């Protein structure tokens, strides 16, 4: 017995090898389980040989059995013909699926979802699964005998089913807090290095700012950098009185790049026309989709809710215009949220990861229904004291004690920042401040000695 | 029209392996034409999306072509047998070697 019938029926293997030989086989009948490695395969070369593409072959071919496969080789001159291989075990689609998983292009997270690696970014979808798009994208990275058969849609559905049924164990995503993900790579914050390609693959970053990183703008000098300092100097004066507030502001600004849990909530306190919304727009333009504006519901309306589920993996949540909770007809901050919005996992798939710096802007000092010592530890406030008013009412603002300086309003800044003019210079400033403060540790300190409501407790003390 | 309008089908007794033979009665040609066809048959098998188009046995196209006769066992120790099928109750409709060129029948051959 020269054949081991542990792989495939000998008749089926002979049928396969005959199908490979387009030319008619002369002695097909005498091939049995005890001679197929011995008798040469004489072939009537009516058509060109299916292996060497020549008119004919001087000598007959021969078969060998090795490694669970059939090796087809020509006698006489070996280099005159191409060696051929017939496999016997495995559905070819299963081999393709094994190769595709083998690349680590498709993974599953703890959410029972499947993330893929298309166009240098970890794509993900739930309504329309996109494993098959990955298969199209990756067919170029496989031999020809796989690319030729990855085209038919039903074969791709079969390969997708195989991949689904082989990806058992879950991987953890977004473990690097000091990496800023774009759509074309990841920027490292500890260094100034940018990784674009397979280098960004190792950091399983499933979110992105939404715009491509450009090395021609992220230099330092910039056409826009100088007036960006002018604007930041005007909004926050570089003075000895407004000194501590300056680095507090810079720390709050930089804490929006780190992808970890933040231990404080910052209040932008200032009067009208102080530039708080200017900073809001600058951050939005600088970090793309990582910045999100929410409503007042997550402060005054019960959490468990799209406004609490969309903050999943967002690195900055900004709250706008608390409507004078000090006066009547208002709902207080209800500090239970302050208990809730800082602890690492947000309930509201009801579990989401919290990487967001929460910044709330206000014109009036806000009040809580209950004041506790845990509120002492997680609240900081930023004071804004520069006025950008129209030429008409400058004096009426220069005689107000709520402002330390009044500046002439420029009507063109909103359109320019909306055009992402200061998009990269401001990001450069953010990185510079991050290296200045958040290396090697990121943590935020509260300022209990600023909110007037906390004075009474200090009066108790 | 000759091959579509008149044909017969055989059914095998093996259910796990669907084995079938279709014989078009009103079409006749020489065997070298079949051998030359084998090429285009292989390309059609590789290109068509129909699952049955994969499972055509082109290796049967060989000198002294042999096929199991209807009503006869494949092997003495095997019980897979090709049986009669309606509406064709004539065994002559299941023999490709039988030649009956009528007015509806068409014959063709290679120029060379
Ligand atoms: N440094 C500056 N130079 C000129 N105009 C400036 C400025 N800083 C801010 N502004 C403008 O003055 C206004 C103050 O900014 P805004 O963010 O709206 O203030 P606010 N209402 O939130 O206190 C805006 O219209 C802004 O475009
Ligand atoms: Zn050859």
UniProtKB/TrEMBL annotation, chain B:
Top-level taxon: Viruses
Transmembrane segments: none
Function: Multifunctional protein required for genome uncoating and replication. Major viral uncoating protein that is required for the release of the viral genome from incoming viral cores containing the viral DNA genome. Possesses an ATPase activity that is required for hexamerization and uncoating.
Family, similarity comment: Belongs to the orthopoxvirus OPG117 family.
Subunit structure: Homomultimer; hexamer. Interacts with OPG148.
Protein name, per record: Uncoating factor OPG117
Species annotation: Monkeypox virus
GN (gene name): E5R
Shown part of the complete sequence: 114 to 225 of 785
